[PDB]
Amino acid sequence: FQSMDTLDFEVVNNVGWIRMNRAAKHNPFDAELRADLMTVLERVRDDADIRVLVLTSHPGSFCANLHVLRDNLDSGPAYWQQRIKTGLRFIHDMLNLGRPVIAAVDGPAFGAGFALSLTADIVLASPRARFSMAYLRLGLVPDLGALYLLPRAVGLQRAKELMFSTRELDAEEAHRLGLVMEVHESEALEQRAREIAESLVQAAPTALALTKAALNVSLDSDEQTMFSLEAASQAAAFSTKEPRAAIEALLSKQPPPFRGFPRRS
Template identity: 80%
Template sequence: MDTLSFEVVNRVGWIRLARPEKHNPFDAELRADLMAVLEQVRQDPEIRVLVLAGTPGAFCAGGNLQVLHEHLDSGPHYWQQRIKTGLRFIQDMLNLGRPVIAAVDGPAMGAGFALALCADMVVATPRARFCMAYLRLGLVPDLGALYLLPRAVGLQRAKELMFSTRDIDAEEARQLGLVMEVHESEALEERVRQIAESLTHAAPIALALTKAALNASLDADQQTLFTLEAASQAAAFAAPEPRVAIEAMLAKKAPPFRGFPKVRT
């Protein structure tokens, strides 16, 4: 693939964007390659966690301006279909039954910001910057940003970030809840690896069910979510992992999954 590389190490799939000379633009080629990787992950139960990383100093610069310029006169139908295709990819990312971690070491602009919002957790470096830059181009936020950002930071702050198009640094992003942890660039991949590999020991069915229920939680009413909780727990108990974990704890042994490792200082 020209736009990214993909490898699996210790049951963790690592996607690394691969066009640093262009700041890893999000275009049709990258979208197609990402969708192909997601299909590979869905078909391989041995891949327990997915990591999405940019390149040193760059995550994703958003849309390819040259390509956008070439299609300025393409008309509403073209743009509607293009955006719908992007949204199908976003749905695939959000509904992937594996944890997704974004490792951000540089700017995540426009669609790049939206791409980071698709991750279940974001780990960043001080070089990370996030910007909803769409209005600078006279455009509406897309790639799911209108849905994802208000749920991450609240409606008023989402409006402020989209209307102002200002950059936010990694520390402000952490304070807003967009970033889980901030680490120096040289420590980023090791910390993401620690988190990802620890999650490979979690019960995969329970983890997928928990992710799906949490994704539904902000849109579902109380009774719907309670019903989903009951059905999900019944499905989890039907899997072999609860027996292994409960019997280990009764025998005063460590269960297979004990959470994330502590941050090393």
Template identity: 80%
Template sequence: MNTLAFEVTDGVGWIRLARPEKHNPFDNELRTDLMSVLEQVRQDPGIRVLVLAGTPGAFCAGGNLHVLHEHLDSGAHYWQRRIKSGLRFTQDMLNLGRPVIAAVDGPAMGAGFALALCADMVLASPRARFSMAHLRLGLVPDLGALYLLPRVVGLQRAKELMFSTREVDAEEARQLGLVMEVHDSEQLEERARQIARSLTQAAPTALALTKAALNASLDSDQQSMFTLEASSQAAAFASPEPRAAIEALLAKQAPPFRGFPKVKP
């Protein structure tokens, strides 16, 4: 794959965008490569967690302006097909039955911002910047941003970020809930590895069921969520995974998964 590198170590799949000279643009080639990796992850139960990172100082600059310019006269049908293809990737990413961690060490602009929103948890360095820059080009936010951003920051703030196209630094992004933790660039990927490694010890069935239920929660009513909770817990108990944890606790031993390690001061 020309746009990214992918490796798996100790149950953690690591995607690294690999075109820093272009600031890792999100184009058809990157989308195709990302969807190929997601399919590989789905087919391999040994991959328990996925980490998405850019390159030092660059996460994803959004659309490739040269490619966009080439297709300005392609017509509405072309653009509708292209955007729908991007949304299929968004759905694949959101519905992946593994935790996804984004490590953002540079600008996440436009579709790059939306790409970060597809992750379950976002870590950032002080070099990270986020901007819904689409209106600068006379375009509408895409790659699922219209759905995802209001669910993270609320409707009014999502409108402000999209209308203004302003850049948000890492600390403000943390305050808005866009970013979970901020770490220096030198520690960012190690913290992502630390969290990912701890999650490889969590029961994969329960983790996947919890992620799916949480994703459904903001679009569901109370009774639907109660029903989903009951069916999800029944599925978790039907798996072999709770036995080890319960028996370890009864034997006064540490269970296999004890949560995230604390952030070092």
């Protein structure tokens, strides 16, 4: 249990809970939050027993810094090319994280917050969740990998309308579009994230990491490359203890350690 400037981090039942802790400020994606998230990721890397992550906030907020923009308006192309790279190093790290990441969204996920939610493996939301890409309001292009991530979630035409309109997607529509897996009342959201995360603790870390890594590049790739990635990944999976444990159980007419997510209740 560690309380940081921009988040609280707690490991309970092999689940790393990242609770962003500046709800009134809407947890802005600034250098301070980036640094705290990097600290979390480094702790996660060094500890295989942190099996699953939940990314969330105090209720009513998620993630949604103009002074730092103002101060750097004329800093020049070389500066901005590098500053974008700093942001992208973080997104790169999220996509490469070999643990499942569940985002629980109970407030605005705008700009950086929407990009952040797009790096999660599973997104759960309440009816309070709002998603928006509003960079064009600032005369800017979408950053933090949004140009890459959004079309892979919703297709080209939908990405275009979202980024040009800068409109807010509500939870129901985000669910309709497959950005959000399930919608729950605000008062029930954390428990659902808990149930799902704790179920994934029982899943094989190797199978999890390899499945995530392959899915994350699938739409960048081609048939033979993905077929070769499948072959290497399955070979790796079969050299772990989990398939035997699962197979023996099922042949003994018993349920395997990972049975999927718990039924909604």
